[PDB]
Amino acid sequence: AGLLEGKRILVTGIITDSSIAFHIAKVAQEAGAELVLTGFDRMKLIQRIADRLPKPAPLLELDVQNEEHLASLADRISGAIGEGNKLDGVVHSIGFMPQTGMGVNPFFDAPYADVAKGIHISAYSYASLAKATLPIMNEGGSIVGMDFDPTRAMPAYNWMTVAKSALESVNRFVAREAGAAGVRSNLVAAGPIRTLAMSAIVGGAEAGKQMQLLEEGWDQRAPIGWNMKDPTPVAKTVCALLSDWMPATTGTIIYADGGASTQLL
Amino acid sequence: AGLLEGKRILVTGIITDSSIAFHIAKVAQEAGAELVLTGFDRMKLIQRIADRLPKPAPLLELDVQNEEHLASLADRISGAIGEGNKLDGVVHSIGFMPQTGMGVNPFFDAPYADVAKGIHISAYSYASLAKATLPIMNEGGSIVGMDFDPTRAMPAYNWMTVAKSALESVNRFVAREAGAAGVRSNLVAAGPIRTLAMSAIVKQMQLLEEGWDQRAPIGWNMKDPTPVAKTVCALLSDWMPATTGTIIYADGGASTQLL
Amino acid sequence: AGLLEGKRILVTGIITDSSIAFHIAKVAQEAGAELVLTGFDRMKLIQRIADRLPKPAPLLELDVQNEEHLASLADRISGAIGEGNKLDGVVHSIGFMPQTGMGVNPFFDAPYADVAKGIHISAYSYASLAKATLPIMNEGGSIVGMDFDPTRAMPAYNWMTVAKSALESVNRFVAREAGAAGVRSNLVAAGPIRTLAMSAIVGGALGDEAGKQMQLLEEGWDQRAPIGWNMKDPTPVAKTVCALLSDWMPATTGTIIYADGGASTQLL
Amino acid sequence: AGLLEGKRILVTGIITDSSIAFHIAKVAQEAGAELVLTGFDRMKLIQRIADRLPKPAPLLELDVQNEEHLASLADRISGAIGEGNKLDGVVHSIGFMPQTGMGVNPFFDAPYADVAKGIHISAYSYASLAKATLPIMNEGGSIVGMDFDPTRAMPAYNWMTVAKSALESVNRFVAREAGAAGVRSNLVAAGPIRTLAMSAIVGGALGDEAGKQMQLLEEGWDQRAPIGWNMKDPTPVAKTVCALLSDWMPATTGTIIYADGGASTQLL
């Protein structure tokens, strides 16, 4: 009798064993959920990663910049979960920003074509994914996306921070549109986790030192501490929002960051 | 194997079976928790209300303005749950503001003695309850308080809104202090609920419910505290172990929309 | 001895005499500023509008999506104000979102190509205008952009609200970059004003529909605003921009100043 | 013809020539304002400080915890400025929290009687001063109070931070009530300034401890501020208050203006 027992959940965003989406999937399966996974581009590599999950799960290709993939997504999910079955949850764990829009590269020097690609993948696709999956979502379902607190400007995060500001805004509109079908939409703002998309912050670096400083500053501010090597608290928080225990929460951000956002040293 | 199986949780704030705390207690017991209840002033009446809960629970007297009640609270909890057993959760569901501080009474005319009493009960006591219970809380425990979004001024709520603004600030400092013991602290900001404390602020509840329901993408029912109670239990569980110092909105999404 | 006496200020975004930028320019000139204006696309029409201002001002073409326009902007400004002279203020009063992204079209139906154009013009260009003008800005100068409070989702405004959320984030990074030059960057969040850009929320409305929607919009804003709100009066917004362009807020950067009657601070 | 020429402004909160209120008063007088000053407790000492100001100003006693002082304040102001004359601005620059509630004392150890005294002086009195002065305020006037950003918990500031969170909420209600008179109400959130009130955060410090803590405070603020921060320079803060007292932000009420070098907008 797990937290997500019998729920059918779409999980995007696995690329390595460090991906936040891998741990969301792992924790969700251990909580009784039946998963459908999506992967971008390197499907054979992503299947090798998914094979280390607790349980088997169908894997569908999804490039969120590809209109055909999005137009066929609901039908392909239905083939994976069985005719007449619907999804109970959707996890958006997708982000990207070209190197010109991040790290030591100057903020003013990022060409808009690069910024627009990052905003397409990191913010607009939260709406795109919701539009594609809502037709096959049960009433009372839950859509969850991954956020990194963009309330204040930060070194290195640069245009990804801008994309997250846009994502938070998109989430409020997705909440409005999904609410008619009784579906909730929320973001989890995680503290920093050692992942690929996080390594994009260090770029062509000294890389360990920057990560150590990042983790140390975050840990010091967090009243309960912060471990960049431990994605599990973040995965659990996503599962809490996918469960039935927060049924009047939508359009919001839940902070899984050790409390670091609420303190000023 | 419930959400709160085996957890020992202190629940303050029951006065009627409409109290948000009554439904927190009901949902928590149905989720496997063992409760200790507190009550203010009318102990026999509160016990009759607590008798309507799914399961029995010891009831302790607590007036949060009474220093002696607070200083002895941990010892009395230990007597109720057994020495060596510790609390896993504490629920603050306590609020009050004199009528001069609310309603049609002009905001400028509330005397400070009345405002100060309301801030004592509604905001400062979140810190005093935490100080009183943290000595017997387990690592990984959870303190949860009840909030009403004070980000913008509202008709009628007046100084209670100010008290909630103070409570949100207090919550961040309680998170800091409780964090050393591995204990989390968070608030649940509920939409309006038909309770005694709500009634004190004001047909008028019908207009409030209508506007809140309209703005909420998933709707809002002022007569249904269960979604709020469930949200409190989510924060009392082990499923949000990196969340502290924050506000979780159980308001139908109304705070995120502008009609 | 006006508020902006002797200051050289670039003002973008005039298209008609209802434009918020027209009133920023008018009030700034009346406060002693010497302006350089920019215009997009309809240069002869915009010049005729600029002719209605209190004082003459050179007009430069600037399409913020045009890389060549941005790359030559500082040189063309220098040609207008004199080589080696510097700007004290820059006003970004530029916004656009295609009808697929705002108004009656469903939120989910906006194609990304359209959203991206709106975000380019409405949010990214705050950064590219800063990049283009900072080389000729005086230490202690001021960059100001126009915002519409995107903290909560709103009907009709849709992807323009998303773009303003991005703009607020961009503003904090522009503040970081411009701060190295001692230059401030801030946004003014205005209440609704009857302009071409704001009429985008009623695109396609027939008969009495546009007037009614505008009446409800103004009434709700006025009701929430403790000091009221008049959608036909851009002057309070223009004055607020001039306040940020002045020397009277020299420690304010990276923030949003609300010129909205206080409506954002109240919940009816 | 200064920014505040001919305006009559009440300035509370002078105790020394380091007081933020002293510099608000100095800058406002240099901008043409006619001031009425108030002081708490040490009236003879405060007069000697006021003697150091550019221009003469009447000084009235005001303990904001004293009902009689508040009830007579408008009549005593009328006596200073002439019967039937009105104030254009009111500046609240008043704050206090006992040492049990701020500095090195543990957060959990503050008795409520002490916290309540601090909230009375630091937050409630913003409402009480507005109530006392609004009867003699011009339509379109301006009330400004001093804030220290309490969005996030901070070491040492402790219950003063809670009081400022309450003050921000009080400001939104004062804006609602004052709006009926056309009067604006706003807070200026200042960065740290070396004053008596700010020294409370190091109460009891010995040897080099106070200086070390003040250096870390300034260095952290200056590092986060894109335009820097100097704790010895209250003038940018004073200017910002004067900007809000002016006629240049006439649609702004219920809000917080950050005069903090931008530090609140950045995360290192």
Ligand SMILES: NC(=O)c1ccc[n+]([C@@H]2O[C@H](COP(=O)([O-])OP(=O)(O)OC[C@H]3O[C@@H](n4cnc5c(N)ncnc54)[C@H](O)[C@@H]3O)[C@@H](O)[C@H]2O)c1
């Ligand atoms: N790691 C952190 O510090 C941190 C903190 C907060 C939020 N996040 C967010 O969590 C989410 C997951 O990132 P992660 O840290 O697990 O990194 P990751 O690199 O493991 O995951 C990013 C995922 O985005 C996917 N993606 C990229 N382009 C795509 C496209 N066109 N279509 C579909 N998928 C595409 C990648 O394939 C990858 O699976 C992202 O939104 C990220 O911004 C990360």
Ligand SMILES: NC(=O)c1ccc[n+]([C@@H]2O[C@H](COP(=O)([O-])OP(=O)(O)OC[C@H]3O[C@@H](n4cnc5c(N)ncnc54)[C@H](O)[C@@H]3O)[C@@H](O)[C@H]2O)c1
């Ligand atoms: N009902 C709503 O609309 C609403 C909205 C959001 C949040 N809240 C908050 O939820 C909490 C619970 O209130 P409610 O709506 O259930 O109303 P309620 O009247 O049922 O509960 C308030 C409780 O506070 C207790 N209390 C008062 N003074 C006390 C004191 N000195 N010591 C100890 N306890 C004392 C009362 O005895 C009562 O049990 C409050 O903090 C309230 O502000 C209520």
Ligand SMILES: NC(=O)c1ccc[n+]([C@@H]2O[C@H](COP(=O)([O-])OP(=O)(O)OC[C@H]3O[C@@H](n4cnc5c(N)ncnc54)[C@H](O)[C@@H]3O)[C@@H](O)[C@H]2O)c1
């Ligand atoms: N009017 C309102 O209700 C309101 C409220 C808050 C903020 N704003 C903002 O105020 C600013 C000015 O808009 P307005 O209301 O005065 O409307 P407007 O239509 O008068 O001005 C918009 C301006 O944007 C310019 N523009 C569009 N595309 C451009 C491009 N590629 N390059 C350069 N300029 C381009 C247009 O030419 C026009 O001059 C905008 O950012 C708008 O979003 C408006």
Ligand SMILES: NC(=O)c1ccc[n+]([C@@H]2O[C@H](COP(=O)([O-])OP(=O)(O)OC[C@H]3O[C@@H](n4cnc5c(N)ncnc54)[C@H](O)[C@@H]3O)[C@@H](O)[C@H]2O)c1
């Ligand atoms: N200095 C800072 O770092 C800083 C930063 C942000 C905001 N502030 C705020 O600025 C305001 C002015 O403080 P300051 O830093 O100039 O310090 P200060 O010690 O010079 O001023 C505090 C003033 O409060 C007055 N006061 C105390 N109790 C009073 C009472 N009962 N009645 C009337 N007045 C009373 C004192 O007499 C004194 O004049 C305060 O609200 C303070 O919290 C200060």
